[PDB]
Design a protein around this ligand. Structure first.
Ligand SMILES: Nc1ncnc2c1ncn2[C@@H]1O[C@H](COP(=O)(O)OP(=O)(O)OP(=O)(O)O)[C@@H](O)[C@H]1O
Ligand SMILES: [Mg+2]
Ligand SMILES: [Mg+2]
Ligand SMILES: [Mg+2]
Ligand SMILES: [Mg+2]
Ligand SMILES: [Mg+2]
Ligand SMILES: [Mg+2]
Ligand SMILES: [Mg+2]
Ligand SMILES: [Mg+2]
Ligand SMILES: [Mg+2]
Ligand SMILES: [Mg+2]
Ligand SMILES: [Mg+2]
Ligand SMILES: [Mg+2]
Ligand SMILES: [Mg+2]
Lengths: 66, 114, 79, 77, 177
RNA sequence: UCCUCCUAAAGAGUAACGGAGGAGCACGAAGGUUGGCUAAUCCUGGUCGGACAUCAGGAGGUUAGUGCAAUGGCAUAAGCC
RNA sequence: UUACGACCAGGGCUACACACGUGCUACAAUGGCGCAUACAAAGAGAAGCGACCUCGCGAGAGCAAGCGGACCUCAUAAAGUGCGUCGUAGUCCGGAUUGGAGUCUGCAACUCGACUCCAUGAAGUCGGAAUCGCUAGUAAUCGUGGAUCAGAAUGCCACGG
C-alpha cells in the first residue's frame, strides 16, 4: 500500500436476506442487507429446470379427449 | 430495492416499479401485491425491508425475467429450424400474423430503402 | 385454436394413415388435405402435400404433431 | 460550427421556492422559474449580483439554502 | 483472510489425497488475480476513463494502473501512449479477500446465470472470465453509472496443466457447468 | 556545398552526365549522473472487441528500438522509466 | 361450340427492394388510470333477438322464460360530473410487433377470421416544399344503431350528447 492513494477499506456485515450471516471488508463505506448469496445458490433448481422445452406429443395427449 | 433482475425504479408506487421486471405487467403487479397484502399506494422508498422479502417470494412462483428469455428465444428458434410458415417468416423478418405486405409492415422491416 | 373439444381432421387421410402403419414404409403418400392436422402415429411417413400445383414431399418429425400439413408447403415463390 | 446532439428533455431547469443568500446580502430570494427546450435566456444585471453563482446553483456547484433544483434529463452541458 | 485459513489445510488435503501428491507443493496454488477492463472508446472523452478508473478502484481497494497503447493501429485510430484502459493486479490478503466476495456475493448477481464455463483455459491451468456488466458488485450505486462497463478477470495459477486447474477452483465451490 | 552505401580489386585513397537515398535541423531535456527494466512476432484464453486495441501465460530471443537517410554498432545496453 | 363451354379438389385475388390516395390510433395534464353517479335519439329481431339464474379472471358455457314486437331482447351509452393517484418522463403517454394459453361461427381458421387472458413494449416528443374541410346546432369532439352477413368494418348509411 502507498499511504492513502487507495480508497477506504470498511469492514461491512454481509447480512443476507434469508439468513446466511457473513462478515467482510469492502470499499463501500456502508453496510448492506442484500439478496441471495452463494449458500442460497439458485444454481441447481434452475439447472434442472432446463427441461421445459421439448416434446409436442405430450401436450397433444391432454388436448385429446374426444 | 432489489428484485429478481433489478429494481432500479424507487420513488414510484409499488404497482408500477414492479412492472420493470421482465414478466410482470400492470396486472401481475396487483396479484403479487394482493398476495403479499401490501397496499398498492405504498412508495418503494418507504416500504419496510421485512416486506420487500415478501415481495421477492412471490416472483419465484411465476416465470420471470431470467428464464423467460430462454423460454422465448428457444421457441422462436424451434420454429425457425422447423421451416414452417411461421419459421420461414422469422428467418426473413416478415409479418407472421397475417398482416399486409403491400404498403405497411414497417415495424418488422425498418426504415425504407430505394 | 380450433376449439376445446374435437380437433378437426379428414376422413380419407386418417384411413390412409392407418394403412401405412399396416403396410409400413412405402411410397410417399400423395395427399391434398392441407386442412388436416398431424398425429403421433404418423412419424417416419413422407406425405406429398399439395402446395397448389404439385406435391412437395416431407419427412415428419416429432414436433410436427400439433400442426397441420399446410404450413409445411409454401404456396408461392420469391426471388 | 457547433456540434448538435439529441434533443434534451422538455424541462431543462426547474427551481421554485429556491432562496440562496450570501452572508451579508441576498443574491436570490424565493426564485420560481422554468427553462424549457430551445429557450434562449440572457442573465443581465449589476456587478456581483449573483449571475455567476446562479449558474453554479443550476449545475449543482454549490448547494441552495432551500427550495430544491431539478435538472434536465438528457443534458450535455 | 476468511478463505486462506481454509485452503492452507483443507484444499491441500482435498487434493493431496486426490491427485496422489507426496508434497504440500506439488499441489497447485493460486497466486494472483489480475483484473482489468479496456475502455477503448475513451477517444471521445477522457471522463470515460477518469470515471471508469474509479470503478475498479471501487471494486478492488487499489488505485488502478492505466494501461497504454503498445503499438499504433490505424483501424482503431490510436497511437502509442493513449490511456485506453485501467488494470489492477491483486496479491496476498487482498487477493483472497476479493476472491471471497466474488464467488459469494458477486457471482450470484449475474443476470441469466446457468453455471460457469469450464473450457476457458489456456493449456497451462489459468482461468479467464468476463461479466458483461459491472453493476453485479455491491459497490456500484446504479446512480453513478453512465455506461455498461464490463471486466476481464484472469485467475493466474501455478498448476502445470488445465485438467488440475479445475480441481483447484472446484475445491473452492466454483460453479463449473 | 555536406552525409551514407556500392563501384573500390580483404590497410588508406581512387573516376565517369555510373547505381540508390538524404542535410541546410531538433533538444533546457531529447544533456550529466544514480537507481531499476527488457522487445518484434505468432499461438492459446478472455465483455462489447473485430484480421489488428487492453489483459493472462506460452514459444521465440532482438526478426524490435534509436528525434530524422544509409552504414557500423548497442544488453554492462547506446533502448524504456 | 368433343372446347374461348361443363363438373371436382388444391392454390391465387391477402405477394413486396418501393412510390401515391383515403382513413384510424397517437405523440399526453383541456390528459391517462381507479372508485362510485348521471342526462338521449334512432333502429333490428323467427332455421331470429336472447332475459333472469349458475359457472367461467374474459371472450363465454348450461339451463332458459319472453317477443312477430310503444309489451320482451340487443339496452350498461360515452364525453360529463365528485373524489383519489400520476408531477413532464419515451412516462401510470403511445398499444405497434412477437411468445404462450384459450372462446366462437363454420365440413373445415396453415397459407387467410374475429374476439379474450397473460406477457412483451417498436416508431412516435406536433410534422419540409406544399395542400384540404367548414358560416350555427355548422366546425370540432363523444358514443349508439343499421344494411351486406354463418363468421368477418378503422369503410358506408343513419342517430343523438
Ligand atoms: N468564493 C466566494 N466567497 C465569498 N463571496 C463570494 C464568492 N464568490 C462570489 N462571492 C460574492 O457573491 C456575490 C455574487 O458573486 P458572483 O460571482 O455571482 O457575481 P456576478 O453576479 O456574476 O457578477 P459580475 O458580473 O460582477 O461577475 C458577490 O457579492 C461576491 O462578492
Ligand atoms: Mg579499401
Ligand atoms: Mg586493395
Ligand atoms: Mg538521446
Ligand atoms: Mg544503469
Ligand atoms: Mg542517455
Ligand atoms: Mg382484392
Ligand atoms: Mg383480412
Ligand atoms: Mg396503456
Ligand atoms: Mg396487453
Ligand atoms: Mg428512436
Ligand atoms: Mg414527451
Ligand atoms: Mg355480420
Ligand atoms: Mg345485422
Amino acid at each position: 500500500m502507498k499511504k492513502d492513494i487507495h480508497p477506504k477499506y470498511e469492514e461491512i456485515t454481509a447480512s443476507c436476506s434469508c439468513g446466511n450471516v457473513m462478515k467482510i471488508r469492502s470499499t463501500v463505506g456502508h453496510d448492506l442487507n442484500l439478496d441471495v448469496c452463494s449458500k442460497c445458490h439458485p444454481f441447481f433448481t434452475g439447472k434442472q429446470r432446463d427441461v421445459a422445452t421439448g416434446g409436442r406429443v405430450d401436450r397433444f395427449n391432454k388436448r385429446f379427449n374426444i | 430495492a432489489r428484485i429478481a433482475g433489478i429494481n432500479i425504479p424507487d420513488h414510484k408506487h409499488a404497482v408500477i416499479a414492479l412492472t420493470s421486471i421482465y414478466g410482470v405487467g400492470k396486472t401481475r403487479s396487483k396479484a403479487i401485491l394482493a398476495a403479499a397484502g401490501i397496499a398498492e399506494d405504498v412508495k418503494i422508498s418507504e416500504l419496510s425491508e421485512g416486506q420487500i422479502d415478501t415481495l421477492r417470494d412471490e416472483v419465484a412462483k411465476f416465470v420471470v425475467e431470467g428464464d423467460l428469455r430462454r423460454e422465448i428465444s428457444m421457441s422462436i428458434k424451434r420454429l425457425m429450424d422447423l421451416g414452417c410458415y411461421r419459421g420461414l417468416r422469422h428467418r426473413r423478418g416478415l409479418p407472421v400474423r397475417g398482416q399486409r405486405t403491400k404498403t405497411n409492415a414497417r415495424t418488422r422491416k425498418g426504415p425504407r430503402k430505394p | 385454436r380450433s376449439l376445446k373439444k374435437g380437433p378437426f381432421i379428414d376422413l380419407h387421410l386418417l384411413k390412409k394413415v392407418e394403412k401405412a402403419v399396416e403396410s409400413g414404409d412405402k411410397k410417399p403418400l400423395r395427399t391434398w388435405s392441407r386442412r388436416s392436422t398431424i398425429f403421433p402415429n404418423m412419424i417416419g411417413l413422407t406425405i406429398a402435400v399439395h402446395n397448389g400445383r404439385q406435391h412437395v414431399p416431407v419427412f415428419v418429425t416429432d414436433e410436427m404433431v400439433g400442426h397441420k400439413l399446410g404450413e409445411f408447403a409454401p404456396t408461392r415463390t420469391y426471388r | 460550427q457547433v456540434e448538435e446532439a439529441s434533443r434534451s428533455g422538455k424541462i431543462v431547469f426547474e427551481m421554485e421556492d429556491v432562496c440562496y443568500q450570501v452572508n451579508g446580502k441576498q443574491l436570490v430570494k424565493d426564485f420560481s422559474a422554468q427553462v424549457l427546450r430551445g429557450d434562449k435566456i440572457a442573465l443581465i444585471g449589476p456587478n456581483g449580483c449573483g449571475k455567476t453563482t446562479l449558474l453554479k446553483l443550476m449545475l449543482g456547484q454549490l448547494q441552495a439554502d432551500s427550495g430544491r433544483i431539478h435538472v434536465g434529463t438528457k443534458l450535455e452541458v | 483472510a476468511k478463505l486462506h485459513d481454509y485452503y492452507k489445510d483443507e484444499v491441500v488435503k482435498k487434493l493431496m489425497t486426490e491427485f496422489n501428491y507426496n508434497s504440500v507443493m506439488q499441489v497447485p496454488r493460486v497466486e494472483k488475480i489480475t483484473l482489468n477492463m479496456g475502455v477503448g472508446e475513451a477517444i471521445a472523452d477522457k471522463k470515460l476513463l477518469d470515471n471508469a478508473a474509479a470503478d475498479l478502484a471501487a471494486i478492488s481497494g487499489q488505485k488502478p494502473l492505466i494501461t497504454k497503447a503498445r503499438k499504433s493501429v490505424a483501424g482503431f485510430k490510436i497511437r502509442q501512449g493513449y490511456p485506453i484502459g485501467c488494470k489492477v493486479t491483486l496479491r496476498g490478503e487482498r487477493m483472497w479477500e476479493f476472491f471471497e466476495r466474488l464467488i459469494t456475493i458477486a457471482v450470484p448477481r449475474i443476470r441469466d446465470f446457468r453455471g460457469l464455463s469450464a473450457k476457458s483455459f489456456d493449456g497451462r491451468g489459468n482461468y479467464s472470465m468476463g461479466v458483461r456488466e459491472q453493476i453485479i458488485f455491491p459497490e456500484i450505486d446504479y446512480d453513478k453509472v453512465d455506461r455498461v462497463r464490463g471486466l476481464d478477470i484472469t485467475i493466474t495459477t501455478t498448476a502445470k496443466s488445465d485438467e488440475e486447474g479445475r480441481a483447484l477452483l472446484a475445491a473452492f465451490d466454483f460453479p463449473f457447468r
